[PDB]
Structures are given as C-alpha cells and as structure tokens.
Design a protein around this ligand. Sequence first.
Ligand SMILES: CCCCCCCCCCCCCCCCCC(=O)O[C@@H](COC(=O)CCCCCCCCCCCCCCC)COP(=O)(O)OC[C@H](O)CO
Ligand code: HEM
Lengths: 431, 55
Amino acid sequence: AEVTQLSNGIVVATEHNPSAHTASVGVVFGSGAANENPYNNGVSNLWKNIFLSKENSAVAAKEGLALSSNISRDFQSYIVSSLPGSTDKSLDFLNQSFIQQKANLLSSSNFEATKKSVLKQVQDFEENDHPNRVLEHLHSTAFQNTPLSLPTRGTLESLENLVVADLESFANNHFLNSNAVVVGTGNIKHEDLVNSIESKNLSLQTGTKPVLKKKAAFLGSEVRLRDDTLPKAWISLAVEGEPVNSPNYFVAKLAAQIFGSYNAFEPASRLQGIKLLDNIQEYQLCDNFNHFSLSYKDSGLWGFSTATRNVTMIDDLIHFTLKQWNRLTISVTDTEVERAKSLLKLQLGQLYESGNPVNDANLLGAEVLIKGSKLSLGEAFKKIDAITVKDVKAWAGKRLWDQDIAIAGTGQIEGLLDYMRIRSDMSMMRW
Amino acid sequence: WGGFSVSNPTIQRFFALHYLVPFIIAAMVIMHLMALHIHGSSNPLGITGNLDRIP
Ligand SMILES: CCCCCCCCCCCCCCCCCC(=O)O[C@@H](COC(=O)CCCCCCCCCCCCCCC)COP(=O)(O)OC[C@H](O)CO
Ligand code: HEM
C-alpha cells in the first residue's frame, strides 16, 4: 500500500491495495455543513438524498455499482463503489451526474418526493435518536453564531424555505475545482492516475470558494431539553480541542483513549480499564461511555458522553468523571500511558485497516483535503510511540485545567446542577 | 419574686434564667429549621416553586 499525488487544476489521490477486490472511485468536496448560513441548513442533505433517490435505479440497471454519500462537517463525499474491472463505467456515470447535466435530476416531482422523504427522516431522527440529538445540541451550543454549530441534517423549519434556487446556488458556489479531489481506493493501479486528469473530463465552473468572515469560536453555553416522558437521561460534556494539522492531534487522541469506553451490560467491560470504572461499579450509576476527541479544519471538541437509567445519580457520575479528568493532568502512571498507547494503536489499526473501500476513501479524502497527502500508518505508529508522560501531562494542563466547558442534555435532567457546580469541580479541589 | 424583698437569690436566678432561656430559643429554632427543611420555602409570586430549583 502506498499513496500518490498529482494535480492539474484539480487534485487526484489513490491508495492502491491489491488484497481487496472492491474498487471505489468518487469525488470529495471540502464544503459541507460548515459552509452554509442558518437560513439554508439542509441543502447538503437534500443534495445527498437527490443523488441517492432516483438515478440509483439507473446505476443498477445500466451497470452494476452501489453509490454512497456522507456529510460530517465539511466533507461532502459522493463515493461510487464498483468491481475491480468496472471503474471506467463508474467514472463515466459520475461525470454524467455532476458535470453534465443536473437539469434532469432537478425536477418538480422528484424534488417534492425527496423533500417529503427528508422531512420524514429528520422528524424520525429528532423523535428517536437521543444520543445523536444531544451531540448535535452540544455542537449547536458550543459554536453559537458561527458556521460550525448548525446541524448536518437541517432544522425542521429550515427545510421548507428553499426549493430550486438555493440548491442550484449551493451547487454553483461550492461544487468547484479548488476544493475537490478524486479518491481511488480499492485495487486500481494507474487508470485513476491518468483518466481523472483529462482535457475536459473534470468538473466545470472554475473558480474559488467564498471566504468565511468568522473562523470559529468556543463559549461555555448550556442547553437543556428537559422532558420527563423519556425513560433515561443523556448528557454530554466537551472542551476546546485542536484542529487537523496540529502537533497535538495524537496527544489529544491518547488522552481520550486513556479513559476509553464502558458498558455495564457486558461481562467483558466491567473488569478492565482505569480507576473511574472501579469507582462506578460499586453503585449502578451509568450505562455507556464515549470519550470522543473530534477535530475539524477550524476547531476540535474533546469531550464525554453517557446515559443513565438512574436519575438521582447524575451528579455523582459527573463529579467522578470530572475528578478523574483533574487527576489526569497531575499524576498518571507510566503503565497507564503504555496501556493507552497500545489501545490507541489497536483502535487506529481497526479504523484504518477495515476492508471497506468507502471508509478508506472517506479517510483519505479527509486527510488529503487539509494537508496534501495522507499520513501513513507506519509514521502514525512511530509518532504515537514518540508520545510520553510529559507530553500528555503538558497537553492536559494546557487544554483542561480550568477551561470553559459546554454541556447538553435531554430526558430526566431534573437532578443536574446547572453550570457553576460542574465548572467549579476542575480547580476547587486540592491540587 | 423570692419573698417580699429583693436579695441575692432574686437577681441571681434572674440572671441564670436570662442565661438559660436563649438555649431553649436555640433548640426551638432547630425545630423551626427542621420544619422548614421538611416543608420547603415559599415564593414572592405566591405560586408553586417546584418547577425550578437551585442549590
Ligand atoms: C448562611 C448559611 C451558612 C452558614 C455557615 C455554615 C457553616 C458550616 C459550613 C459547612 C461547609 C460549607 C463551607 C464551604 C464548603 C465548600 C463546598 C464543599 O466543600 O463541598 C463540595 C465538596 O467538594 C468535594 O468533595 C471536593 C473538594 C474537597 C477535597 C479537598 C479538601 C481540601 C481540604 C479540606 C479541609 C476541610 C475539611 C472539612 C470540609 C467540610 C461540593 O461541591 P463538589 O466539588 O462536590 O461539586 C458538586 C458535585 O457535582 C458533586 O460532588
Ligand atoms: C427568631 C428566630 C428565627 C429564625 C432563626 C428563623 C429562621 C428562618 C429561616 C432560615 C427561614 C427560611 C427562610 C429564610 O431564610 O428566612 C424562615 C422562614 C420562615 N419563618 Fe423563621 N425564623 C425565626 C423566627 C420566626 C418567627 C418568630 C416567625 C413567626 C412569625 C417565623 C416565621 C417564618 C415563616 C412564616 C417563614 C416562611 C418563609 C418561607 O416561605 O420559607 N420565623 N425562618
């Protein structure tokens, strides 16, 4: 496995892997949910559904290929999987889809059907999925009045205020030749390297992406969605993280991995880990853990999430988690760091070793749209091994000791102290 | 009043009881706070206060 790079007007990337036999080729745009004003929120989701809606029959009829999509914060990706010997067909279909012509794909009936389907889907998401809801609310409350807080699926009222003008405007303003790459993950050697760059076989509308007046921000805002009908209580915490291409990415990832995950209803999860697991097992407080270290091109979010059937025990859980975070920055045994390093090595190996071509293409585009070339796994392992106790202690002291935090919650949140009791528990303790 | 006159016992017992009664004040105030904590506190609005509370 190796990475190649080249450019003429556009950028072309490829990570050949002859072991797998599922070639996937598609484009990736560096403009998603972070490049849209709050009055135009679900335009990217409408694009995704309108490319997943109607021509999905044509792709399976005329040829054989399964087409996917993904929008996370700015990486609007349209991957077209295929068989190893049928990549040119996928590229030709992608060209006939984007560059010419999208007028047929933009009709009144098709758009109305996509609109009602998207409305039903977003309503269902807002009804059922609670942890994702609290994650989106944490994002929307940490980045108040900033093009990084609005959700990636579109607020309910924002959908029905845009039909054909906003969608085409987004296409003409973001689907450009400056922030687009052509991934080639699979088992293709050099056809992607040559056919992507042609006299006219590239996206039209040469130009530049509009600049953003506001880069990012982070203020400690609290949001609650108290409602006693739900049985459980989902709460999330976060602090300021680091963006991609910073010499703190892997240290933050290791700090997240130190505490790891947990699941009380699994016999293999109650007997491992670090101290807070032991402190929690004595009384049934929590059910799930998710120590996440998210990073975006502007700013990151290193946080925590949980969900408890017990409602009176929320304060104790939050206090114990904050106390453990406090202990992280003063005294960590070298054994803890070694175990966290091994666990993170395994985790990144699983993440970057999965046989899915689509996930590898997504990661490749994500890491190439910011730096220019993907950071290989061997170098990643070497620099992971470079980390020591001093570096993680320094990062924890810099980014955790008495820093502004954001909180979110929903369900039975009657027993959650609002903002000063939680914030005070990071420096009031004897040090 | 310790007889028809005033002597050492009268003023001494008066001082002792002025010393002692505030202890009964303290005990009954303890009872007052116990009842308060059991039944909670009211609001200037003259309406229910269980909707929102703070430590
Ligand atoms: C007008 C009414 C009051 C009149 C006067 C009252 C007189 C009695 C005073 C009683 C104590 C109150 C004085 C101030 C106490 C500060 C708060 C405190 O100690 O309690 C915290 C307890 O804090 C801790 O448990 C950690 C800090 C203590 C560890 C460090 C100790 C240092 C040395 C202490 C010496 C004193 C020992 C006796 C303390 C009672 C609660 O907050 P938390 O950090 O737990 O946050 C809440 C969280 O969500 C749930 O935990
Ligand atoms: C003299 C010693 C007393 C002490 C230390 C005391 C203390 C308190 C305290 C702490 C409260 C809770 C609200 C607040 O802090 O004010 C309270 C409430 C109250 N007290 Fe007292 N009290 C005393 C005397 C009295 C007396 C003599 C009355 C008689 C009229 C009284 C009637 C009340 C009432 C009606 C409330 C209700 C306030 C609320 O709605 O919570 N108290 N008292």
